[PDB]
RNA sequence: AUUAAUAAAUAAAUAUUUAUUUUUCUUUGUAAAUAUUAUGAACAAUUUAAUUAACUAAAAUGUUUGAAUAUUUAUUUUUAUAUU
């Protein structure tokens, strides 16, 4: 759920040094507020397992972030990731990402 | 003279390992997903594993290698049934290629649903989660 | 398979380096088999003659030119680096131990008769 | 032939899809009533 | 019935399969 | 939500709890078909929504058997009522049904070749009643603890429903901790009978 | 077996030659490396086995006269 | 206990037949799982195709203990893909050449280079060596349509 | 008698119906009736066209022509003979009416 | 066991029929297809060498063959062969005098037998207006 | 499927379910031949008793 | 109705007494015999013969310590394609060969690996032209074909793979 | 690297090898019609079909007569032994339309 | 298949001859002309839902423990391969 912004900024900067953001949003909204370093998926794909190979192999060592406009959609994506074996999942929004500077 | 091929190209997997090394062995147990029952492979299953389509005379060297040859090396003629078998193999290849092409075309057009199964399977099997949204 | 009075080579499934050559003596039809198909109901009778076409072939020569990799252990799947014709690659020992009281005991000679070496 | 084949396909689909129908007391199919999904006492683990 | 030929099918013998001897130029 | 659907439906506030597919929980505002909506409204089980009713509504308390329990229709109350009604709906669907099974029994026989399992019972429950449950909840009788159902005709098992103590369904049902799933095994056509 | 509905039809007894049953093992049978067969007799050590490049096994054994 | 003994007596099929029925049920369950699997999968160009399999549990249970018929296929999937980038894929695709296509073919590479069809025509084919080992296509007139 | 057929495998011996993928007789009748009803409804989707005199069946064309014969020889608009064999009234407006 | 659990990729092995069989030049970025379209397209056996001709072994399709009787095309092309009344044959549309019996429910049956299931045939061998009015006396 | 020394008579009806698959409690074969010819009798399953 | 009158009167000499003397009785008996023999051949003869072969192989296996069951399973595992008739023939006429096969089955010798799948060489992915010569994949395939040619038998073409591959230069004429 | 695959993503489908294991003619005509749609008429017949909703519906309908094996497009391409850059669409376009 | 009897698209089954390349992943026997057409069920229950086979070989189908023994409660022993 929602968390502070400075902590997320510092974590994303000096922890990952890669891509760990999965964006589950409509194409129109994604184009309106795009994020270059976040990979765009669909919550149905996450829940079905089409994204299994792209997702990181090291479940424990991989902490993921989910970018969505709907809290229910973000929770569904987190549930899909946890079902596939990714418990370290957090939710972020475009406003938080912009304030952090990840955009 | 004699011939012994398991692959079209004639290549074969290394059968004899290096001296003093523990050799690899096949999976004697059947390919059943569940741990039980713990059944050993049948003779027909071994034939399938080794390449023959369950029977000695269906696929493999016993079906693909000519049964005779002239002493001076001249090969044998193309029997009608030999041509029919070659056509059957080409038909299997064509089926595979056409199925793959159909899947690719459906993917390109966007018809492959993101949901795992059809409506009937989804409402029959609880194992498929709910994709409502 | 190939073999002789002193050796036997098997194919899994086939072999290589085997020259089996024959001569096609005849191209004929074997004895006819008569299949008479009829049913008590319908007044229809079918008379099929199957003379099984065959080729009679006389084998003229058999030769073998195997390419051996090395000695192969039986009781273990490993293949030996060194071949010792003077020692059995897999020694064998008798069964009787005395623990099995109700064991069908054969004559002692057969029960423990040692075997020679077939390479010296 | 097209109409007959389409009718046969539709009949097969109708007779093979709805294997079982929800009990009329719970919901009358003929009255258009339908039963939603109750996932209260459910689980997420792949059992 | 209708045949799908999903399984191996032996080609039917037909007169067009006769082994035609190739024309050879005369010896003279 | 379409205009025609809204025309053939009508919003209504449920004074008490009705477990039917067209029912609801106390204080629920729902779009219900005109026929059953009028039925409930005339029976006194529902009323047309209004601002005052939405802010607060009177309901039926079985202790006095009168529509004299005033309650505010806030978000937390709505969530709790939805959960309680979902529990009661699962209980009622299980209790007021007859779980059909189509299995193979070679010849005439007296029981089925492949015994039913908790997974099979759960799948049939989902197929018929559209209820998802952990198979571990389903528990067979003493006669069927070791080899499953393994018998034709009328059979039943137990379905445990946790959370009844929290939600307060002590006196609203026969037993709040158990539900009797009543099953009926039968020989059916080849297409319907798998396994 | 057969239920009440099925009509009894006494079949002709199978007067064929059945292969005798063999000893059964629970561990060796289920092991993948160890084969079902357990043969070890007096003349077993004289059947030397060699590998072949094609994949076959070349067996050196004593002659009929020697046996 | 009494009803348990009664049920034990009331067995329609022998034990072997019951085992076969159980195996049939297992096959049905396996088919259900296969159909439950997703329609497609999102794959990366660089990663080996074998990454992220639904059969990992069975593979670990069986293959790692003993070889399977698909050992070569598994090795190929384990090995990384040989087409690293879309640019490389496009380069190879451009290099690819189609011969049986109906339309025309470029010839700017070399004027002196002629196509086999142009040199000999459509109705004429090489006298392929007709032998058991090497069987050529027959009746190109039939092949056409 | 029963139509015997040349077999290609023991599966054909075990087979009872020559075309297993074909509906039984009653299902065939049901499917044929449904298909005919659908075709009829598709034909009647448009109204009942009032065909002219020349397009009537052979047993109405001549009667109508004889009924209106005098008007044909003496040309004046507004002459209609109310014959009995003509096409029946549909009962609703149609594009062709 | 008749319940074998083996992959169907094993059930249908593609080891000795790889893609190169139909696309021989595929490995060299050349997509040329040489596929044996159908068993119907089989011109027949052909000798590989002149020194090993195929044997002329009689088959029942080419051995069980009768002498050629001049047909209408042959007699029209070369009238010299129309040497007999036998050669003067009728139109080819004339199969011949009818054989067998056109039984009602079974079609044409051979004269041999199988008469038990045919009674309508014999019945035929042994050989509404009331509701409509009369428009005039003469009709 | 065989002589009495290999297949007892009550085992003939082994394809049917019920008590017939259990060994009868009373055998009247060795002693004498009863007039009614009943050779086997099962344990009373209530007031009912089965005879062969 | 057709009956094998002329065909069976010929062999009517093979019966006894009334059948051999009177045409009708002999023809009826011969027709019945032919039909029964056809039925037996098409529905029981193979079963009986293969049961006999099974029993012979089983007896040989028992004498060698094994049995038909384990022998069949291990033959399947080792990929030795000997039909039961061939196994019986080998056991009866080549006891040493049959014992060698049994020893192979008994031994912990790794069974042959499964057939390999066609492998695409890196030359196929190699670009051609880079930006008179031969495609590297085609050259590799030609080398494999020449190797198969040489290894099929002791042909006199020579064992020099490079010399064989450079054969066309022999027929080429320098301008 | 414990992170999502950093590169362009390609969708890959599946192919079903369907093998008939029970006599199709012993079932109802709907099952036989579905099997024929899958191109199956006798026991022991194997067919290769695309992974599409219609094929999945048919296989679900006849799942008690059919044993299914899955092959991703990558696995099928490796099985047939063709370069990864070539496309099954290209192969289909090249192969003749009057094959069988 | 089956409607006697005023303006209603169509009886079906079998046989004979004959007709129509309509697109969708696969698959699919539709139509017309003509000949013939008593091989015959009474109740109950439920329901707008439940005798065929070309030859050779191959071939996967198949008597105790909610009691017993004992004495004035204690004892007892509760997977495969393979064959049409």
UniProtKB/TrEMBL annotation, chain A:
Domain of life the protein comes from: Eukaryota
Name of this chain's protein: Rhodanese-like domain containing protein
Organism: Trypanosoma brucei equiperdum
Parent-record interval covered: 38 to 140 of 162
TrEMBL record, chain C:
Gene Ontology cellular component list: mitochondrial large ribosomal subunit
Single GO term (MF): RNA binding
GO biological process: translation
Keywords: Ribonucleoprotein, Ribosomal protein
Keyword Oxidoreductase: no
Family per record: Belongs to the bacterial ribosomal protein bL21 family.
Name of the protein this chain belongs to: Large ribosomal subunit protein bL21m
Naturally occurring in which organism (per UniProt): Trypanosoma brucei equiperdum
Residues of the full protein shown: 66 to 185 of 188
UniProtKB/TrEMBL annotation, chain L:
InterPro entries, alphabetized: Ribosomal_bL20 (IPR005813), Ribosomal_protein_bL20_C (IPR035566)
Gene Ontology cellular-component annotations: ribonucleoprotein complex; ribosome
Keywords, comma-separated and alphabetical: Ribonucleoprotein, Ribosomal protein
One GO biological process term: translation
Gene Ontology MF annotations: rRNA binding; structural constituent of ribosome
Protein family per UniProt: Belongs to the bacterial ribosomal protein bL20 family.
Protein name: Uncharacterized protein
Organism: Trypanosoma brucei equiperdum
TrEMBL record, chain M:
Tree of life domain: Eukaryota
Protein name in UniProt: Ribosomal protein L30p/L7e
Organism listed in the record: Trypanosoma brucei equiperdum
Residue range from the parent sequence: 51 to 150 of 218
């Amino acid at each position: 759920h929602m968390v502070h912004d400075s902590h997320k900024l510092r974590e994303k900067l000096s922890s990952r040094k890669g891509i760990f953001v999965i964006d589950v949003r409509d194409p129109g909204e994604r184009k309106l507020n795009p994020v270059p370093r976040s990979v765009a998926l669909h919550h149905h794909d996450l829940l079905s397992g089409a994204s299994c190979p792209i997702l990181p192999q090291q479940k424990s060592a991989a902490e993921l972030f989910v970018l969505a406009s709907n809290e229910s959609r973000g929770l569904n994506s987190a549930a899909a990731l946890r079902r596939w074996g990714y418990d370290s999942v957090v939710q972020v929004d475009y406003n938080t990402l912009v304030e952090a500077g990840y955009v | 003279y004699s011939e012994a091929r398991s692959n079209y190209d004639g290549t074969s997997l290394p059968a004899w390992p290096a001296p003093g090394k523990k050799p690899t062995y096949p999976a004697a147990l059947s390919e059943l997903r569940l741990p039980q029952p713990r059944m050993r492979k049948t003779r027909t299953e071994w034939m399938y594993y080794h390449g023959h389509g369950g029977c000695p005379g269906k696929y493999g060297p016993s079906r693909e290698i000519a049964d005779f040859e002239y002493a001076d090396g001249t090969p044998a003629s193309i029997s009608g049934r030999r041509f029919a078998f070659k056509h059957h193999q080409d038909h299997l290849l064509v089926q595979l290629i056409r199925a793959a092409a159909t899947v690719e075309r459906y993917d390109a057009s966007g018809l492959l649903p993101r949901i795992p199964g059809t409506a009937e399977q989804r409402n029959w099997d609880p194992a498929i989660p709910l994709f409502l949204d | 398979m190939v073999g002789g009075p002193r050796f036997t080579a098997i194919g899994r499934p086939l072999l290589e380096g085997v020259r089996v050559t024959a001569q096609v003596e005849e191209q004929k039809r074997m004895r006819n088999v008569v299949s008479l198909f009829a049913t008590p109901g319908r007044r229809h009778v079918r008379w099929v003659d199957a003379p099984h076409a065959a080729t009679i072939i006389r084998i003229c020569e058999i030769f073998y030119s195997p390419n051996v990799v090395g000695e192969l252990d039986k009781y273990k799947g490993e293949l030996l680096e060194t071949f010792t014709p003077g020692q059995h690659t897999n020694p064998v020992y008798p069964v009787d131990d005395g623990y099995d009281v109700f064991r069908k005991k054969d004559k002692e000679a057969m029960e423990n008769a040692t075997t020679f070496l077939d390479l010296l | 032939a097209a109409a007959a084949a389409a009718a046969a396909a539709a009949a097969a689909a109708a007779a093979a899809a709805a294997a079982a129908a929800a009990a009329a007391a719970a919901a009358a199919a003929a009255a258009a009533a339908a039963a939603a999904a109750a996932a209260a006492a459910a689980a997420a683990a792949a059992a | 019935v209708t045949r799908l030929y999903t399984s191996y099918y032996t080609g039917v013998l037909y007169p067009n399969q006769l082994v035609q001897p190739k024309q050879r130029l005369p010896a003279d | 939500m379409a205009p025609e659907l809204q025309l053939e439906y009508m919003p209504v506030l449920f004074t008490r709890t009705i477990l039917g597919p067209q029912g609801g929980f106390a204080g629920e505002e729902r779009l219900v078909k005109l026929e059953v909506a009028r039925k409930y409204m005339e029976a006194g089980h529902a009323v047309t929504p209004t601002e005052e009713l939405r802010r607060g509504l009177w309901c039926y308390n079985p202790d006095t058997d009168k529509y004299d329990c005033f309650i505010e229709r806030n978000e937390e109350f709505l969530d709790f009522a939805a959960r309680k009604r979902q529990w009661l709906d699962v209980y009622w669907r299980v209790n007021t049904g007859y779980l059909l099974f189509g299995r193979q029994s070679w010849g005439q026989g007296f029981l089925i070749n492949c015994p039913l399992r908790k997974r099979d019972v759960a799948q049939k429950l989902w197929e018929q009643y559209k209820v998802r449950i952990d198979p571990r909840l389903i528990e067979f009788r003493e006669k069927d603890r070791r080899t499953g159902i393994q018998e034709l005709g009328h059979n039943w098992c137990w379905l445990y429903l946790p959370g009844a103590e929290e939600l307060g369904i002590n006196r609203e049902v026969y037993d709040n901790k158990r539900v009797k799933v009543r099953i009926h095994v039968r020989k059916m056509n080849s297409m319907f009978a798998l396994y | 077996f057969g239920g009440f509905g099925m009509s009894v039809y006494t079949p002709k007894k199978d007067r064929r030659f059945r292969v005798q049953p063999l000893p059964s093992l629970h561990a060796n049978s289920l092991a993948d490396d160890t084969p079902l067969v357990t043969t070890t007799r007096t003349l077993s050590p004289n059947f030397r086995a060699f590998a072949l490049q094609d994949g076959g096994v070349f067996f050196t054994h004593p002659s009929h006269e020697q046996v | 206990r009494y009803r348990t003994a009664w049920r034990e007596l009331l067995h329609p099929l022998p034990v072997r037949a019951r085992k076969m029925e159980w195996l049939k049920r297992d096959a049905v369950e396996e088919n259900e799982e296969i159909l439950r699997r997703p329609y497609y999968t999102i794959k990366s160009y660089a990663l080996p195709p074998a990454v992220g399999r639904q059969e990992s549990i069975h593979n670990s249970n069986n293959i790692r203990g003993g070889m399977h018929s698909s050992h070569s296929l598994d090795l190929i999937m384990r090995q990384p893909r040989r087409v690293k980038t879309p640019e490389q894929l496009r380069a190879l695709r451009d290099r690819l050449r189609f011969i049986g296509v109906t339309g025309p073919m470029p010839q700017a590479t070399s004027v002196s280079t002629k196509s086999y069809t142009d040199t000999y025509g459509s109705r004429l084919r090489p006298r392929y060596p007709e032998s058991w080992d090497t069987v050529p296509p027959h009746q190109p007139s039939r092949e056409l349509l | 008698l029963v139509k015997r057929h040349k077999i290609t495998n023991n599966q054909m011996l075990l087979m009872r119906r020559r075309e297993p993928y074909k509906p039984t007789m009653k299902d065939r009748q049901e499917i044929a009736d449904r298909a005919k009803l659908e075709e009829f409804e598709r034909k009647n989707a448009d109204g009942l066209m009032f065909v002219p005199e020349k397009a009537l069946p052979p047993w109405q064309k001549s009667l109508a022509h004889n009924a209106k014969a005098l008007g044909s020889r003496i040309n004046f608009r507004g002459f209609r003979v109310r014959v009995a064999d003509g096409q029946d009234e549909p009962g609703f407006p149609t594009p062709f009416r | 066991r008749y319940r074998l659990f083996h992959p169907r990729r094993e059930a249908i092995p593609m080891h000795m029929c790889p893609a190169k069989t139909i696309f021989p030049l595929i490995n060299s970025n050349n997509l040329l297809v040489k596929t044996r379209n159908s068993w119907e397209d089989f011109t027949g056996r052909k000798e590989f060498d002149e020194d090993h001709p195929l044997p002329v072994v009689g088959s029942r399709l080419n051995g069980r063959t009768t002498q050629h009787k001049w047909n209408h095309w042959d007699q029209y092309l070369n009238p010299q062969i129309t040497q007999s009344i036998k050669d003067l044959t009728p139109t080819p549309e004339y199969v011949g005098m009818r054989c067998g019996h056109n039984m009602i429910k079974m079609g044409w049956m051979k004269i041999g037998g199988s008469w038990k299931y045919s009674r309508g045939y014999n019945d035929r061998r042994r050989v509404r207006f009331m509701l409509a009015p009369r428009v005039s006396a003469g009709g | 499927t065989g002589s009495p020394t290999h297949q007892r008579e009550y085992e003939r009806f082994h394809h049917l379910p019920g008590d017939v698959r259990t060994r009868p409690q009373f055998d009247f074969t060795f002693g004498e031949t009863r007039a009614d010819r009943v050779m086997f009798a099962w344990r009373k399953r209530g007031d009912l008793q089965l005879y062969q | 109705h057709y009956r094998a009158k002329l065909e069976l009167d010929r062999i009517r000499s093979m019966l006894r007494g009334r059948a051999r003397l009177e045409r009708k009785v002999g023809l009826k008996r011969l027709f019945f015999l032919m039909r029964t023999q056809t039925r037996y051949r098409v529905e029981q003869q193979a079963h009986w013969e293969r049961a006999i072969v099974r029993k012979n192989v089983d007896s040989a296996a028992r004498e060698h310590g094994t049995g038909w069951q384990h022998l069949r399973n291990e033959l399947g595992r080792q990929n030795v394609m000997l039909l039961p008739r061939s196994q019986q023939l080998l056991a009866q006429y080549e006891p040493l060969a049959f014992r060698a096969v049994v020893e192979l089955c008994a031994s912990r010798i790794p069974p042959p690996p499964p057939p390999v799948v066609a492998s695409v060489p890196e030359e196929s992915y190699t670009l051609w032209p880079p930006a008179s010569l031969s495609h590297p994949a085609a050259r590799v395939e030609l080398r494999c074909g020449v190797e198969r040619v040489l290894r099929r038998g002791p042909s006199g073409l020579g064992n020099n793979v490079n010399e064989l591959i450079d054969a066309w230069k022999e027929f080429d004429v320098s301008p | 690297a414990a992170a999502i695959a950093p590169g362009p993503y390609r969708r890959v489908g599946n192919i079903f090898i369907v093998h008939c294991d029970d006599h199709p003619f012993k079932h109802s005509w709907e099952v036989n019609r579905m099997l024929r749609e899958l191109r199956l008429e006798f026991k022991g017949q194997t067919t290769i079909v695309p992974d599409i909703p219609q094929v999945r519906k048919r296989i679900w309908r006849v799942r008690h007569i059919v044993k299914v094996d899955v092959l991703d497009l990558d696995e099928a391409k490796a099985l047939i032994g063709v370069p990864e850059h070539i496309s099954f669409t290209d192969l289909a376009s090249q192969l003749p339309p009057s094959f069988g």
